Amino acid sequence: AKEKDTIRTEGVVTEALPNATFRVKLDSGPEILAYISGKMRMHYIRILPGDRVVVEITPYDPTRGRIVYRK
Amino acid sequence: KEYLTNERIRAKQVRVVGPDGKQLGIMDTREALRLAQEMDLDLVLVGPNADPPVARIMDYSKWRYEQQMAEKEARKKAKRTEVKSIKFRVKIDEHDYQTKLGHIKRFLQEGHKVKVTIMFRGREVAHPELGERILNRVTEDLKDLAVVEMKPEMLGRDMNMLLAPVKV
Numbered sequence A: 001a002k003e004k005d006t007i008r009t010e011g012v013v014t015e016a017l018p019n020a021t022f023r024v025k026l027d028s029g030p031e032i033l034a035y036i037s038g039k040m041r042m043h044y045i046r047i048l049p050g051d052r053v054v055v056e057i058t059p060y061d062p063t064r065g066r067i068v069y070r071k
Numbered sequence B: 001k002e003y004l005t006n007e008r009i010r011a012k013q014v015r016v017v018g019p020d021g022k023q024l025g026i027m028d029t030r031e032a033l034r035l036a037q038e039m040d041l042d043l044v045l046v047g048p049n050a051d052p053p054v055a056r057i058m059d060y061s062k063w064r065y066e067q068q069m070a071e072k073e074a075r076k077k078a079k080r081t082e083v084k085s086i087k088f089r090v091k092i093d094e095h096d097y098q099t100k101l102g103h104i105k106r107f108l109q110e111g112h113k114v115k116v117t118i119m120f121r122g123r124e125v126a127h128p129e130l131g132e133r134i135l136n137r138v139t140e141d142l143k144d145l146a147v148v149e150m151k152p153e154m155l156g157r158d159m160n161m162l163l164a165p166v167k168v
Helices: A039-041 B029-039 B060-076 B094-110 B125-139
Strands: A010-017 A019-027 A030-038 A052-057 A066-071 B013-017 B023-029 B044-046 B053-060 B082-083 B113-115 B144-146 B162-165
Touching: A010 A030, A010 B053, A019 A052, A019 A066, A039 A066, B013 B029, B013 B044, B023 B029, B029 B044, B029 B053, B044 B060, B053 B060, B060 B162, B094 B125, B094 B162
Parallel strands: A030 A066, B013 B053, B082 B113
Antiparallel strands: A010 A019, A010 A052, A019 A030, A052 A066, B013 B023, B044 B053, B113 B162, B144 B162
16 A cells, blocks of 8 residues: 655754664654664765754654654 | 093092092092092092092992982882873763773873873764763763863864873
């Protein structure tokens, strides 16, 4: 079916976990371990804490975000 | 530093000084030499810059040794304590940070001044907010052992503080 559902909200990069996973605190609030986007990985786009990044977030589990855009 | 001893002295009349401080006045150099020989010592020109050169009957080698000892003392009293440096990073985890802190503490105890630089590398823009915060935290942690000699001074791809021991 492919559901259009996600929230394209931004956030501050709090902390770098392994893989390229980050606890990023959003515009609105809650910090979710957010993993980097595949696209980003492909174009080698690094992130460090102290950044403002676009983070696509799921309806099923609003706890695992996905860092979409290059900052 | 060093002088002319007995045979090295070529000047004819010299002022003769004793083992402790025996003023023998301006005598001949030969006479002085003879005196030294009698004493089983050596006449050494201690003030070549003085009225018919001032020359002490002494054990020259002994004097030299004494001088050397004094020099050594001076350089051992020059305080071996210096700067220990501890490059931190931006993304430094907790355990590692604590280890670093411990190291710093040890250095302080030893007596050392501590260059507590934060290494930066990539973005180096958000740097002060996080890096500065980290530095502040470090300072807070060492409130009791370390007085901040400095304040965070960004030069290269980094920012350095120095730290000093609280009480000497």
